[PDB]
Amino acid sequence: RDPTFYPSPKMAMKAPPEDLAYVACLYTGTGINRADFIAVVDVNPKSETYSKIVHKVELPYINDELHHFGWNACSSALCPNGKPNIERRFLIVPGLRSSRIYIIDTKPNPREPKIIKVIEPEEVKKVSGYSRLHTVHCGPDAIYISALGNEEGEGPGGILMLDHYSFEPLGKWEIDRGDQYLAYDFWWNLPNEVLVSSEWAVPNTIEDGLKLEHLKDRYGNRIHFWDLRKRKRIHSLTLGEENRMALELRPLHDPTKLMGFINMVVSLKDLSSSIWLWFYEDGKWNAEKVIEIPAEPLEGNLPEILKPFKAVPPLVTDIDISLDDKFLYLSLWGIGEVRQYDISNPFKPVLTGKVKLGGIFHRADHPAGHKLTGAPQMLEISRDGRRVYVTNSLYSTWDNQFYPEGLKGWMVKLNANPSGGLEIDKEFFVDFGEARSHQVRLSGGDASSDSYCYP
């Protein structure tokens, strides 16, 4: 058995720390004519190449727009229906713009992964009928990948599957989608057989940037609940009539818990961000707002898109939960923060940590001296829950609207306190030059790469 497969959250937490951090990096949107790439960062303090990019898996094409990626297999393989002879070996890297899928082998040398197979954009579109690939999740039965829209850039968007052995596209996952049309992220509670999916907007809406006039009719605010087995949409809930952009879905790691969180990026009423708790109770799926962060008034130094409001929206774009289900971390891509919320009681989160990094509001530089463009966006937590990695790019054209001076990628490390507390690690820092950084995957698995079948 693969030593990185963990039956449960508890077992995952007690496993050896991560030695490396794979980071999705891009030149898409920077004006630089170079391919996007996967950066290999040495993340072991005892290593002589600690906090250094030790290798770059440079891609064969330009403008893929790397964003989110995942493993071919993970802890879910230990599930009753988990397929035989699969190992956590390949990084499945899709192009959010190109729809291309790279299969990158991390063996036998994890420090120097190699592209061993490419699924071209037209094969992906031909088989699944979807384009603009986003989230990748390793399931017991197959590899699942969400897509923003249909082959024309409109909708419905959805989830496609890739074969565990050939890595070839199988097709659409949906058998009965009800009235689901928009998509973005998705995840599941495997033993309870339910899949949840969110909503951003279709490709033709988001690719050229955020158009405030599009918000009301072109962005979504619903979470969809599906029967994982029958591949059927069974229910949906609206997360505030006035909220838009239902992004990141995070079920609690303990599979006996039928709940999780999701972030609503912006309110059409006051530009606030809100975190919602979805949960099953009294034979029904429910959803309640548990966290709300208001915009911060500011008169000058505002980007064009924000000038009219004289405020900085928090723009909570990513969330992640520690393996013990004790902490909820949020990034505020607008204001410039990473927060830690104690969710011992999911219904009543308590702020226990906050750091300032970049941001239109804080413009906070790194304690070591580094100038930080952009703000915290994607986050990733070590399995032991003590380290939080942070990158700063959201999307090529959106970066350019909120940080018009030119967003340059970095990766920051935060030291999280198991009993409450968040600090910026002064020593650790990766500056990606003119390239921008997005999702991070830690060798051996992390807090958003694996789902478990045992409590």
Torsion of CA 23, 29, 33, 36, to 10 degrees: 20
Contact 255, 452 (CB under 8 A): yes
Nearest to 66 by CA among 165, 114, 136, 10: 136
The C-alpha atoms of residue 249 and residue 158 are separated, in whole angstroms, by 15
Rounded to whole angstroms, what are the CA distances from 267 to 233, 245, 278, 315, 346? 26, 9, 18, 10, 22
The C-alpha atoms of residue 288 and residue 70 are separated, in whole angstroms, by 29
Q: Is the peptide bond before 108 cis (omega within 30 degrees of 0)?
A: yes
**Residue 6: exposure state from Cβ atoms within 10 A (0-12, 13-18, ≥19):** buried
Contact 297, 308 (CB under 8 A): no
The C-alpha atoms of residue 327 and residue 341 are separated, in whole angstroms, by 5
Q: Tokens for 264?
A: 């609503």
Q: Tokens for 195?
A: 């899949």
Rounded to whole angstroms, what are the CA distances from 216 to 211, 220, 281, 367, 424? 10, 9, 31, 40, 37
Q: Tokens for 157?
A: 């968007």
Cβ density class 284-297: b for 16+ within 10 Å, e for less: ebebeebbbbebbe
**Residue 423: exposure state from Cβ atoms within 10 A (0-12, 13-18, ≥19):** middle
3-class DSSP state for residue 145? Answer: strand
The distance of Cα 405 from the centroid of its chain, to the nearest Å, equals: 25
Cβ density class 187-219: b for 16+ within 10 Å, e for less: bbbbbeebbbbbbbbbbebbbebbeeeeeeebb
Contact 360, 312 (CB under 8 A): yes
Q: Return the sign of the alpha-carbon dihedral for residues 68, 71, 72, 74.
A: negative
Q: What is the DSSP letter of 254?
A: S
The C-alpha atoms of residue 380 and residue 444 are separated, in whole angstroms, by 13
As for the chain, the residues directly before each break of C–N over 2.5 Å are none
Helix, strand, coil percentages in the chain from 3-state DSSP, rounded to 5: 10, 40, 50
The C-alpha atoms of residue 451 and residue 68 are separated, in whole angstroms, by 17
Q: Can you give the length of the chain in residues?
A: 455
What's this structure's resolution in Å? 2.0
Contact 45, 382 (CB under 8 A): no
Experimental approach: X-ray
The C-alpha atoms of residue 420 and residue 442 are separated, in whole angstroms, by 23
Q: Tokens for 388?
A: 């939080």
Contact 327, 344 (CB under 8 A): no
